[PDB]
Amino acid sequence: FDCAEYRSTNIYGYGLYEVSMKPAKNTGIVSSFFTYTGPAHGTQWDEIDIEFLGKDTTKVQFNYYTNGVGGHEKVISLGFDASKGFHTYAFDWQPGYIKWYVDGVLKHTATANIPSTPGKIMMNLWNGTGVDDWLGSYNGANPLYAEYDWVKYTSNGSVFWEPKSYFNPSTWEKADGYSNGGVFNCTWRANNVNFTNDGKLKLGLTSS
Ligand SMILES: [Ca+2]
């Protein structure tokens, strides 16, 4: 299986991160929006996540890692099926808290051991292996898509607006030609990152 990952080339810090998206629906997969920096780049592993488990798109999972330590998973019920339309998901990341919102409504707050290292904005779609309890087993269904209409990052003195109508190499990069291995049971392919004519980033999960 081939999957997809899109990531910023720059780093961003504290502020409001918003994305308008529509995750894919299927057992065994995840569609995400998150920030990330790792020892892979050094720093210290700090990451804030919005993950949609395809097994049940009526919920969304929030989580974070501070210094390689995670386990802050919070599953919230949305009140609607996320895969049926675009909604706005955001997280307000400040030095002493992370606040998550759905369509402008506050849904979760965290104040413990909050990350502080600036990272890249990343979006991916992938199928797991060895985590059937978390994601359900992946059944090989495909192609599957996760779509993103726009991304916005607002700090108090700047705004990063990305409407996703075309590929901009100075700002983003596509993952390609490798697998994360581990529970990621797919290889990242640049060809699986496409832009629709109407201005949406469309990540796909396909066979091969
Ligand atoms: Ca757009």
Ligand 1 centre to CA of 160 (Å) is: 14
DSSP, collapsed to helix, strand or coil, labels residue 49 as strand
Report the structure determination method.
X-ray
CB 160 within 8 A of CB 79: no
CB 37 within 8 A of CB 145: no
DSSP run (H or E) holding 173:
strand 172-174
Active site residue 73: no
Ligand 1 centre to CA of 143 (Å) is: 22
Ligand 1 centre to CA of 78 (Å) is: 23
Report the relative pairing of strands 2-8 and 187-188 from DSSP bridges: parallel
Which stretches within 104-196 are classed as H helix? 132-135
CB 55 within 8 A of CB 28: yes
| Residues shown for the chain | 208
Ligand 1 centre to CA of 146 (Å) is: 14
| Choice among 5, 18, 47, 147 that is catalytic | 47
Burial class (CB in 10 A: 0-12, 13-18, 19+), 158: exposed
Cα(204)–Cα(193) distance, integer angstroms:
7
| Choice among 51, 73, 147, 162 that is catalytic | 51
Paired strand residues for 20: 88, 150
Cα(58)–Cα(71) distance, integer angstroms:
21
Cα(149)–Cα(198) distance, integer angstroms:
9
Cα(77)–Cα(12) distance, integer angstroms:
29
Ligand 1 centre to CA of 163 (Å) is: 4
**Token duo for residue 160:** 């990063």
The domains located in the chain, with CATH, are 1-208 (2.60.120.200)
Cα(42)–Cα(92) distance, integer angstroms:
24
Look up residue 12 and give its DSSP letter: B
Active site residue 18: no
Ligand 1 centre to CA of 123 (Å) is: 15
The CA-based dihedral angle spanning residues 11, 121, 36, 78, taken in that order and rounded to the nearest 10 degrees: 150
